[PDB]
Structure formats: structure tokens, C-alpha cells
Amino acid sequence: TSHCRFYENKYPEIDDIVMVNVQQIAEMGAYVKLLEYDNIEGMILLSELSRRRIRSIQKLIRVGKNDVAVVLRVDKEKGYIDLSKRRVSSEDIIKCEEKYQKSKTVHSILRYCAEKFQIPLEELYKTIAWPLSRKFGHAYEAFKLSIIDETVWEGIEPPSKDVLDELKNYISAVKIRADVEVSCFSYEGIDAIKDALKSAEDMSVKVKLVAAPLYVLTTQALDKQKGIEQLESAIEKITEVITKYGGVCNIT
Amino acid sequence: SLVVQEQGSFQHILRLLNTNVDGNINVVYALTTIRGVGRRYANLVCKKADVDLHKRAGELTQEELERIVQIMQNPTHYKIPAWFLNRQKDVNDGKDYHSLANNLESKLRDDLERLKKIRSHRGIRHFWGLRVRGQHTKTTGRRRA
Amino acid sequence: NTKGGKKGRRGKNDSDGPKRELIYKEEGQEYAQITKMLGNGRVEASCFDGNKRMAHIRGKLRKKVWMGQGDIILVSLRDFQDDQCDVVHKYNLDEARTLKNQGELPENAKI
Amino acid sequence: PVTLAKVIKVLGRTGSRGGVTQVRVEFLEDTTRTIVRNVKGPVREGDILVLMESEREARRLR
Amino acid sequence: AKHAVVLDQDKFDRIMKEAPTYRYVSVSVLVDRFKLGGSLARVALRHLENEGIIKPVSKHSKQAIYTRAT
Amino acid sequence: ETATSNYIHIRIQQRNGRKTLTTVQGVPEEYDLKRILKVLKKDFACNGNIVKDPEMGEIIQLQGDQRAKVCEFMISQLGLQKKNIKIHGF
RNA sequence: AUCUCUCUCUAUGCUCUCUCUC
RNA sequence: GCGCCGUGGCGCAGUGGAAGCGCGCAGGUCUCAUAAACCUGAUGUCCUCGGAUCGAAACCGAGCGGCGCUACCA
RNA sequence: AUUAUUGCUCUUCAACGAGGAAUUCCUAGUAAGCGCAAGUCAUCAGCUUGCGUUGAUUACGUCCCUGCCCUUUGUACACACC
RNA sequence: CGGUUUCAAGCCGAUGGAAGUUUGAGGCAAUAACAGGUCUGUGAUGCCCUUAGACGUUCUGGGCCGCACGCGCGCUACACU
Ligand SMILES: [Mg+2]
Ligand SMILES: [Mg+2]
Ligand SMILES: [Mg+2]
Ligand SMILES: [Mg+2]
Ligand SMILES: [Mg+2]
Ligand SMILES: [Mg+2]
Ligand SMILES: [Mg+2]
Ligand SMILES: [Mg+2]
Ligand SMILES: [Mg+2]
Numbered sequence: 003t004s005h006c007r008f009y010e011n012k013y014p015e016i017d018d019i020v021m022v023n024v025q026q027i028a029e030m031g032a033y034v035k036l037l038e039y040d041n042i043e044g045m046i047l048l049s050e051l052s053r054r055r056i057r058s059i060q061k062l063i064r065v066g067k068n069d070v071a072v073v074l075r076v077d078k079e080k081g082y083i084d085l086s087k088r089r090v091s092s093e094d095i096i097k098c099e100e101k102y103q104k105s106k107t108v109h110s111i112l113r114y115c116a117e118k119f120q121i122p123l124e125e126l127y128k129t130i131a132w133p134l135s136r137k138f139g140h141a142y143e144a145f146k147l148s149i150i151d152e153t154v155w156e157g158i159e160p161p162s163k164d165v166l167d168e169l170k171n172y173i174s175a176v177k178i179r180a181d182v183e184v185s186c187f188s189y190e191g192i193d194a195i196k197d198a199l200k201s202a203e204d205m206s207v208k209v210k211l212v213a214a215p216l217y218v219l220t221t222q223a224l225d226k227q228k229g230i231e232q233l234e235s236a237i238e239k240i241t242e243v244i245t246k247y248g249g250v251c252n253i254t
Numbered sequence: 255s256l257v258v259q260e261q262g263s264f265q266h267i268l269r270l271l272n273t274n275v276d277g278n279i280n281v282v283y284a285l286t287t288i289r290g291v292g293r294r295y296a297n298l299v300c301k302k303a304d305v306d307l308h309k310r311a312g313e314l315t316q317e318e319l320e321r322i323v324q325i326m327q328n329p330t331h332y333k334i335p336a337w338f339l340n341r342q343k344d345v346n347d348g349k350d351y352h353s354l355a356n357n358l359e360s361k362l363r364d365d366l367e368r369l370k371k372i373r374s375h376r377g378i379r380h381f382w383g384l385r386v387r388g389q390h391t392k393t394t395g396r397r398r399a
Numbered sequence: 400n401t402k403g404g405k406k407g408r409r410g411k412n413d414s415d416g417p418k419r420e421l422i423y424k425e426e427g428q429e430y431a432q433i434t435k436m437l438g439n440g441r442v443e444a445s446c447f448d449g450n451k452r453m454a455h456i457r458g459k460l461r462k463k464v465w466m467g468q469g470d471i472i473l474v475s476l477r478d479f480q481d482d483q484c485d486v487v488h489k490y491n492l493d494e495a496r497t498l499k500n501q502g503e504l505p506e507n508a509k510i
Numbered sequence: 511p512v513t514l515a516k517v518i519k520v521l522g523r524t525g526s527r528g529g530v531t532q533v534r535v536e537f538l539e540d541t542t543r544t545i546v547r548n549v550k551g552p553v554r555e556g557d558i559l560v561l562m563e564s565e566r567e568a569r570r571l572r
Numbered sequence: 573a574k575h576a577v578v579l580d581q582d583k584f585d586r587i588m589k590e591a592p593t594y595r596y597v598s599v600s601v602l603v604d605r606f607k608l609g610g611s612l613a614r615v616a617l618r619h620l621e622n623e624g625i626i627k628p629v630s631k632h633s634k635q636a637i638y639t640r641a642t
Numbered sequence: 643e644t645a646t647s648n649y650i651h652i653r654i655q656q657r658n659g660r661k662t663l664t665t666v667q668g669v670p671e672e673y674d675l676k677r678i679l680k681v682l683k684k685d686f687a688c689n690g691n692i693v694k695d696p697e698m699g700e701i702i703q704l705q706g707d708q709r710a711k712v713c714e715f716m717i718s719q720l721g722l723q724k725k726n727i728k729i730h731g732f
Numbered sequence: 733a734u735c736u737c738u739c740u741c742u743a744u745g746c747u748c749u750c751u752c753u754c
Numbered sequence: 755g756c757g758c759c760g761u762g763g764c765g766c767a768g769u770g771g772a773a774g775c776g777c778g779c780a781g782g783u784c785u786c787a788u789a790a791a792c793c794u795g796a797u798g799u800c801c802u803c804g805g806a807u808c809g810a811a812a813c814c815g816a817g818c819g820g821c822g823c824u825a826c827c828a
Numbered sequence: 829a830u831u832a833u834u835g836c837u838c839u840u841c842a843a844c845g846a847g848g849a850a851u852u853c854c855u856a857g858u859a860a861g862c863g864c865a866a867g868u869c870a871u872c873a874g875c876u877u878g879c880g881u882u883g884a885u886u887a888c889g890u891c892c893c894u895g896c897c898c899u900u901u902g903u904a905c906a907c908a909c910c
Numbered sequence: 911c912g913g914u915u916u917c918a919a920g921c922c923g924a925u926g927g928a929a930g931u932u933u934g935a936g937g938c939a940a941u942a943a944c945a946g947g948u949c950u951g952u953g954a955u956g957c958c959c960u961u962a963g964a965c966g967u968u969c970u971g972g973g974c975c976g977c978a979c980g981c982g983c984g985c986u987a988c989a990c991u
Contacts (some may be wrong), residue, residue, distance in 0.1 A: 023772060037772075055740085058792065060849065068772055104773090110771055117808045144813075171806080172770085172813075179757095181823090192827095209820090210756075213824045259581045266575075278577045292839050295600045310577075337837045358839070375831060384977080387832040391977040397843070398978085403745065406910055410945050411747055462747045508820030528890025552887080572738055572892095634990090651764085658743050658789050667765070667777080673805070695766055695776080730764090730778075 004116070006127045007040035008105050010135045014039045014083065018073040019094075021102035022046075022067050022085065036083065037068065044083020046071070050089045063087075070098050079199055104142035111145075115165050126161065133158040149173050149226065175207075176223035180233055182240070184215050185250040194249050202239045206232070256308075264312035270319060271326075271355050277311050284311035288355035290340065291326065299325045302332050328355060402465065413463065421494050424503065428475040428487065432508045436468055442486065444472060447504050452476075457485040464489050471495040471504070513561045517539065517553060521546060525571040535559060537572065573609030578620040583607055587616060593605060597626050647725045652709055653672075654731025664712050666702035673721045675700065685715055
């Protein structure tokens with residue numbers, strides 16, 4: 003069986019923003035599964051589901067669908083969630099959505115590994131997601147940091163390096179657009195442009211011809227932000243290297 | 255009642271009469287998975303063979319399985335009369351047959367073809383994709399193909 | 400049920416049937432498509448002959464049989480006048496189709 | 511927190527849907543208080559009525 | 573249940589050592605605490621009850637009520 | 643250069659009673675919308691309501707079954723073409 | 733002098749008509 | 755060839771598990787009836803094909819169509 | 829008896845994981861489960877009509893929705909609010 | 911009996927009772943109608959029609975039981991009782 007909570011500790015906190023997938027409607031409201039915190043059952047009492055009277059229940063809330071929510075009453079003993087949908091402020095909603103997305107992404111990461119090798123899920127959770135969270139706040143932030151520069155994976159060890167490699171691969175060449183508008187109208191201008199390209203493309207990406215004045219090259223990114231540094235270099239080359247030819251070039 | 259624990263002798267998931275026979279279903283009910291084989295008649299076959307029904311699917315030794323197969327494919331010799339088998343009387347030989355696995359369907363297909371050739375009502379209905387055995391299509395059969 | 404069920408529809412009873420015999424043409428009487436359904440019993444209806452006309456509802460159908468837009472209709476033309484003419488019999492959609500198939504009316508308009 | 515009061519007299523039955531009883535609750539801990547309480551369901555005289563609510567009271571139900 | 577309809581020797585041993593300490597012994601209980609799932613559990617229970625091991629409370633079939641000796 | 647024929651969708655929208663609604667989808671955004679609505683209101687017995695869609699599109703409401711009449715009116719009062727119209731429903 | 737104090741949308745609908753003998 | 759829309763029908767939007775909105779058709783429910791008001795839809799997995807990874811329409815490619823760049827590339 | 833009348837033996841094993849918005853029925857031998865006989869009938873009950881076995885849960889109330897009853901009230905309505 | 915109620919009309923609780931909801935359920939059901947339902951129960955009929963190649967009548971054979979669909983009753987199930 004697959005279980006275990008999204009965050010570090012077992013039980014939710016007061017005034018925690020959650021996203022709730024609707025299961026079934028009863029009397030109090032709905033016995034929803036909180037997708038920001040484990041799968042513990044809770045309810046939205048019929049007073050705090052919407053800001054205004056909307057009469058219809060199965061169009062603004064909907065069975066099977068997700069709702070932007072906040073946790074009101076929590077009892078750290080066994081398992082009760084008194085929940086609200088109304089108390090979520092304007093804006094804020096977007097943030098909540100983002101958080102939910104992040105959580106989902108995190109969840110997606112932690113299952114492939116399990117599939118590849120069974121072994122207790124709690125242990126896996128401990129060795130992948132929690133220490134980072136403790137250090138900062140959320141696991142997605144940690145993941146982002148890792149992607150930017152690999153150091154968070156060095157902190158707590160994965161069960162195998164293969165998994166890490168796979169993750170890296172998943173994260174990974176990324177195409178970045180680079181458009182060159184050369185102000186040429188001469189017969190031997192195209193050739194010149196080509197020559198210029200050949201001195202800049204070498205030593206490291208994919209140059210596409212659209213027109214005689216317009217040239218569109220796609221630059222590869224290995225670690226996402228590595229593509230910006232190559233683009234910059236290319237730009238520099240246009241201003242510094244291409245001066246001997248005397249061909250006027252413009253960048254979008 | 256069996257106190258016998260049994261060591262590594264029974265191999266689950268068996269390939270018997272081409273169609274895959276699954277694991278730990280109760281011999282009779284393990285045989286039922288094969289087309290043409292059905293509950294009561296499977297039980298009868300087992301009885302004829304003289305194997306105890308209260309056993310595992312993997313438990314069965316090869317000889318027993320062979321015997322069972324023989325009973326199934328050649329039914330008439332082992333005291334199984336008319337109110338017993340699949341194609342009683344039959345249209346092609348006069349002898350009755352207990353058709354199995356990949357035979358019954360073929361027979362059905364053949365019958366359908368013959369009907370089509372000879373343009374009979376049932377055949378026509380089958381060709382159409384309609385209900386045959388006394389049904390009012392005012393409500394019946396809205397699932398389609 | 401006729402139009403909208405009602406408390407006040409059970410004091411009427413309509414008798415014609417969907418399986419009724421189709422009515423043919425007469426002298427001073429021909430077929431029209433309805434151009435636009437006008438007010439106060441008046442109706443603009445283009446004839447199959449080739450004249451524009453002004454059609455008018457005359458009794459009978461005034462409450463019994465409701466009509467819509469673009470319908471094939473029996474119009475008995477005025478023998479003394481010409482511009483004002485009167486609707487006699489409404490044709491069903493099936494009926495219209497049958498007529499079209501026959502070729503009794505000229506094939507110019509669709510149901 | 512736990513409180514309990516005995517009922518003594520019923521102040522009729524009120525509710526849009528109805529059914530819900532208006533009761534006069536007397537506390538067995540100090541009989542000086544006789545409060546108007548909302549009670550859901552079949553209730554007579556001389557019954558111990560547990561109250562999670564301590565002080566809040568309402569009369570009519572609309 | 574993922575099969576688990578085997579009167580395995582190891583399984584039998586486990587049953588022997590796990591039926592005490594716990595007061596209640598049933599097929600359902602066995603299924604819950606991960607050993608045998610279904611029909612052969614009953615058989616096992618029956619063959620544990622020859623002389624001693626687990627004492628009966630039930631005088632009824634379908635549901636088994638059994639307590640280990642204290 | 644501008645496209646001469648754009649898909650103007652005059653749809654069947656169900657209004658109070660057996661009556662309907664002339665709803666216009668894919669409206670050319672060149673002339674003043676409010677003014678056109680006002681004009682429409684004046685000409686017929688209709689009330690004008692505009693439902694806004696992001697980037698492209700504005701749903702223009704006119705209470706009633708006219709269609710052809712509406713088209714004719716549009717033709718009469720400059721702002722919209724003859725070829726652009728499409729009747730949607732039945 | 734004993735009241736106690738409740739609450740909101742909901743548009744329209746076309747098919748007749750009837751007396752007696754004193 | 756690039757970019758977005760790739761549907762469960764049109765018209766609008768979102769990218770790593772959650773069948774996204776407005777309209778339309780198809781059908782229901784509520785009312786004596788229609789409309790508003792409500793649900794359910796349809797090629798089951800959101801271009802065609804398969805894979806890395808359990809998986810996904812989303813990640814990757816070969817392969818198509820509409821327009822945001824091109825101007826006919828001897 | 830084909831457009832299986834039905835019955836019985838056989839084999840064939842789909843949809844269907846307790847059911848959206850909606851709405852019916854019911855306050856004690858009642859609800860429901862379960863049969864049976866009769867009616868139809870030459871043959872056929874998933875139907876009705878009557879029995880009888882098994883036998884709960886919750887109300888004993890209010891007018892909120894849906895009606896009804898009278899009293900008062902207002903009606904530009906008597907085809908009487910459709 | 912017990913209390914309550916201008917202590918009248920009655921009601922709720924207790925005792926006794928086979929039983930205290932009019933003891934349960936029926937069956938008959940007023941005045942007034944509806945333009946409800948039926949001439950497809952009839953030899954209950956007015957009126958109009960067809961009346962001898964008959965809408966009468968019977969024999970032979972279908973058909974009401976057809977099926978892209980949409981509702982209404984009911985049954986069987988979705989299993990451990
Ligand atoms: Mg009538
Ligand atoms: Mg019959
Ligand atoms: Mg009105
Ligand atoms: Mg007395
Ligand atoms: Mg009586
Ligand atoms: Mg007659
Ligand atoms: Mg004749
Ligand atoms: Mg019939
Ligand atoms: Mg009935």
C-alpha cells in the first residue's frame with residue numbers, strides 16, 4: 003500500500019492552505035481528501051463553502067474536482083479536519099494553486115523510485131524529501147535549488163545514484179530562441195552572414211535560415227540557465243568579432 | 255481435511271489445452287477458465303478421473319491432468335450420455351461432441367456462415383447485429399458495437 | 400398533450416390523426432411557402448407559382464393548428480381580388496416531403 | 511468542559527421544519543437558573559440533558 | 573489478497589508462534605496480520621485444534637471464536 | 643490588407659418561453675460596440691448585452707427570433723458586411 | 733405594562749357558449 | 755520549417771498524476787407547459803505513432819493541419 | 829411454435845464495485861425481505877389480486893417546500909392566475 | 911383514579927384489561943360539477959356515413975412482439991447478514 007504525508011510532520015496545522023479533491027456530499031459538507039496534506043478525511047461545514055449564495059452545489063464545488071481551501075480546526079490526537087473554502091482571500095488563491103502544483107510534482111517524483119524498487123515508502127520519504135523541507139520549508143523549492151545548482155542532493159543521500167541520474171535526465175537539451183536581423187541587401191551579404199555564423203557556432207547551436215536578412219538559431223541549454231551564458235557570448239561576438247567584415251547586424 | 259503442509263512440488267500457473275490455466279483455483283474451478291469447460295461438467299469430469307476436488311490448481315500431477323484432458327476430449331466412452339455434452343446429436347456427424355477451447359466458437363461461426371448462405375431469419379439478424387431470441391428492441395440492446 | 404398540457408386544454412379534443420390522407424390542389428387554390436409569419440392573423444407567404452401575395456388566416460386553424468416559419472401551405476386565392484389571399488390547409492412535414500417526391504409542387508423550396 | 515441540566519417544562523415546539531423542542535432547563539448544580547434551550551428530539555420532564563454549550567441561548571427557530 | 577492460499581511450512585511455524593500472546597484467533601485475524609488469505613486458513617485453524625494449542629469458545633460454524641490457553 | 647470575410651456566428655440561444663435569442667459571436671472590433679448596441683435597441687424591441695472574452699471575441703446578445711431581419715438591418719446601417727453572416731442552430 | 737425577532741428569487745401562457753314550460 | 759490551437763462538438767485557456775471554462779447540439783430533471791435554473795454527454799484517456807519512466811493529453815522524437823517570421827532561395 | 833410460447837440439460841459468461849442532479853413510498857404486525865394461491869389461462873408471471881411466514885429503524889410534531897380546509901382581507905379575474 | 915382546561919366540551923399519563931390511535935383495516939360516500947374516461951362492455955342508444963368486388967361476415971397469411979433513440983412501471987444483481 004502507498005501512503006505517507008506530503009510535508010515533514012504527521013498532522014496538519016491551523017490556518018494551512020490546502021487543495022481538496024471532492025469525494026462525496028453528505029450532510030455537513032463533503033468528506034474530502036486534502037492534497038496538500040496526506041489523504042486524511044475532513045469536512046467543509048455548510049457556511050464557509052462560498053462567499054455568496056450560489057444555490058447550486060454541483061457547479062461551483064463539483065464531485066471529483068479540486069477546490070482551493072484552508073484548514074480551520076485541527077485536533078492533534080486522532081484525526082479531524084474542520085475545513086473552509088470561503089476564508090481563502092482573493093489573490094492568495096493563485097499561491098495556493100501553485101503550492102498544490104508543487105506538491106503534485108513532488109508526489110510524482112517519489113513513486114517512480116518506489117516502482118523501480120519496492121522497499122518501505124516511509125523510509126524513502128525520509129531519505130528524499132524531509133531533511134530539505136526542514137532546512138527550508140517546501141520540497142519543491144529544494145528541488146528548484148538543486149536544478150539551479152546541484153547541492154541539496156549532496157546533503158541527504160538517495161537509495162541509489164541511478165535514481166538521481168534519472169531525475170537529472172528528466173529535469174534536462176533545452177531550446178532557447180536567438181534571432182539575428184542583419185541589415186544586408188547586397189548579393190554577397192548572405193555569404194558574409196553565413197561566414198559570421200560559422201565563426202560563432204563552433205566551439206561550445208542549431209542555426210535555421212528563414213530569410214536573407216533574418217536568421218533564427220536555437221541555442222541548447224544543459225542545466226537550463228547555461229543557455230543564457232552562450233546567448234550572451236554570441237551577442238558579444240556580433241559586436242566584437244564581426245567588425246572586420248563591416249556588416250551591420252541587429253538583435254531583437 | 256488435510257494436515258499436509260506440502261513442500262516445493264506444486265507449480266502455479268499452468269499451460270493446459272493452449273488456454274492459460276491460473277493458480278490456486280479449486281481444480282474444477284481452475285478448469286472452468288477454459289472455454290467449453292463449465293462448472294458442473296468440469297466437476298463431473300474430475301469425478302470420472304478420480305481426483306479429489308479439494309486440491310490446488312498447481313497440486314495436480316501431469317498424469318492426472320492428461321487423464322482429465324482425455325475425459326474432456328473423448329467423453330462418450332466414460333459413461334457420459336446425451337443430457338451431458340455440448341453439441342448433442344449434431345448436424346455434421348450424428349455422434350454427439352463436447353466441443354472445447356477453440357472449437358465451439360469455430361462451430362458457431364460455421365453455423366452463422368451457413369445461415370447467411372441460406373438466408374434464414376436468425377442468420378439475417380446476426381448479420382444485422384440485432385437481438386434474435388424473442389426480444390422487443392423498443393428498449394432492449396442500446397449498448398451497440 | 401397538444402401544446403403545453405394545461406388545466407385548460409382538456410375542454411377541446413382534437414381528431415385528425417398523424418396518419419391522415421394528403422389533400423391535393425383545386426381551381427383557384429395553390430401551394431405556398433411562408434415568407435414571414437405576420438401579426439393579427441395576417442401572414443406573408445410566397446406562392447410556388449411566382450407571385451408574392453399576402454396570405455391571411457381564415458378561421459378553423461386560428462386556434463386548432465399552430466404554424467411556424469417556412470411551411471408548405473394550401474392557399475385558396477381570391478377570385479375577385481388578388482393581393483389578399485387566404486390559407487385553407489396546413490401541410491405536415493412528412494406530407495410536404497411526399498408532395499416534393501411526387502413532383503406536384505415545383506421543386507424550388509426546402510422544408 | 512462538561513455541563514448537564516435537568517429539564518422540567520417544555521416551552522412548546524418551534525421550527526420552520528418543526529420537530530425541534532424549546533425547553534426550560536434547570537441546573538442540578540444550583541437550581542437558581544432556568545434557561546430557554548434548544549433541544550432536538552423526544553424529551554419529557556425530569557431528564558438529564560448534557561450541554562456542550564455553556565451559556566448561549568435562542569428562542570424561536572427560523 | 574495477493575494469492576497467499578498456501579499451507580507453507582514457514583507460514584505454519586509463524587502461525588504457531590503468533591497465535592499465542594494475541595487473545596483472539598480467527599481466519600479474518602490471520603488475513604489481517606499477513607499470513608494466509610482465505611480458504612486454507614480455516615483448514616490450518618482446524619488442524620491447530622486437535623488437542624490443546626487454542627481453546628474453542630464458539631459452538632457455531634462460519635464464524636470462529638477461539639482463545640489461546642492461559 | 644484586411645480580410646473581407648470573417649465568421650460572424652448568429653446562434654440559437656433559448657430565451658423566456660418558446661422564444662429565442664440572436665447571439666452574435668466573432669464581432670469585428672473596429673466600430674464602437676455600445677453605439678451599435680444602442681442602435682440595435684432603437685431599431686427593434688431588443689436589449690443589448692455584451693459578454694467579454696479574453697484576447698479575441700465578444701458575445702453580443704439581442705433578445706428574440708429575427709436572424710434574417712437583423713442581418714437586413716445590419717446591411718442597411720453601415721458597419722458590417724453581407725458575406726460575413728452565419729446562422730447557427732436549425 | 734411582558735412584547736420578544738426574522739429571512740430572498742419566481743418570466744410568460746393563445747382553445748368559444750347555453751335556456752325552457754305557469 | 756518555425757510558434758500557439760491541437761477535444762468530448764464550437765469558441766476561449768493550462769502545462770509533469772486531479773476529465774479546464776463559456777456556448778452549442780444530444781438527452782434528462784424541476785413546473786400543468788416552455789424558458790431561466792439545473793446535471794449527464796460524445797473516439798475514454800486533451801494531433802498521428804510509439805518509447806524513456808508504473809504512469810500522463812503534458813517528457814522525447816519521426817509524421818499532419820491553421821495562422822505569428824520568411825518572400826519564391828539559382 | 830420460425831420472429832428462442834414455455835419448460836428442462838448443456839455450454840456461452842457482458843454490462844453491472846450500491847448509482848448523477850432528481851423523486852416516489854412508509855409512523856406498527858406495519859416498511860422491506862420472502863414466498864404462495866387466485867385472475868388471465870390449452871400452453872406461459874417478471875404482472876396484478878389476495879393470503880400468510882420473517883420482521884426493523886425512526887416520529888407522535890410542525891406548517892418551510894407541495895397541497896387542502898375554513899375565517900378575514902385585496903382583487904381592473906370569472907374561459908376565474910394556466 | 912391522578913392531575914390539567916370558562917372545570918363544560920374534551921385531551922395526555924398510570925391501573926385493570928384479549929384489546930383504550932374511532933381497537934386495526936375496509937365497504938357503502940353528500941351537494942355540486944368536470945365539457946375527465948369510454949359508442950372498443952352491450953341487444954344502452956340519437957345522428958352522419960359505408961351497405962354488396964361491404965368498414966357486415968368469415969377463411970389463409972402476416973402485424974400489434976419492428977428498432978439509431980427518449981421516458982414510465984417492475985424484476986434480477988452489484989456478494990459474506
Ligand atoms: Mg373531453
Ligand atoms: Mg405469448
Ligand atoms: Mg400569470
Ligand atoms: Mg376522570
Ligand atoms: Mg370505520
Ligand atoms: Mg355504433
Ligand atoms: Mg373487397
Ligand atoms: Mg402489445
Ligand atoms: Mg402500476
